[PDB]
Amino acid sequence: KTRYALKDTDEEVREFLQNNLHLQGKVEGSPSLRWQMALYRGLPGR
Amino acid sequence: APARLSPAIPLEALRDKALRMLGEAVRDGGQHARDPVGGSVEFQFVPV
Numbered sequence: 001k002t003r004y005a006l007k008d009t010d011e012e013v014r015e016f017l018q019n020n021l022h023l024q025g026k027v028e029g030s031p032s033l034r035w036q037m038a039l040y041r042g043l044p045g046r
Numbered sequence: 047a048p049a050r051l052s053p054a055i056p057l058e059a060l061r062d063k064a065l066r067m068l069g070e071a072v073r074d075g076g077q078h079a080r081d082p083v084g085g086s087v088e089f090q091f092v093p094v
Contacts (some may be wrong), residue, residue, distance in 0.1 A: 030078075031077070031078050031079075
């Protein structure tokens, strides 16, 4: 959202996010995302 | 007066019990739940 606040185009933010693939969540140890992961894994879809 | 000794209490039960609370406390502390045994984490780990 802040990148969009920089008046950056779609290509600019797409390249901006493409270089931050390593910076995913990876906070599975925290309790805030502990139940969210389980709920997502419990979906009837894919 | 033959001054009295300390009151007795089953030591085997006490040692087995005390290990159980400490084992549970260190296990329940990993979940980082919003409801400790006492008022806070201080009252949960210090008395044991």
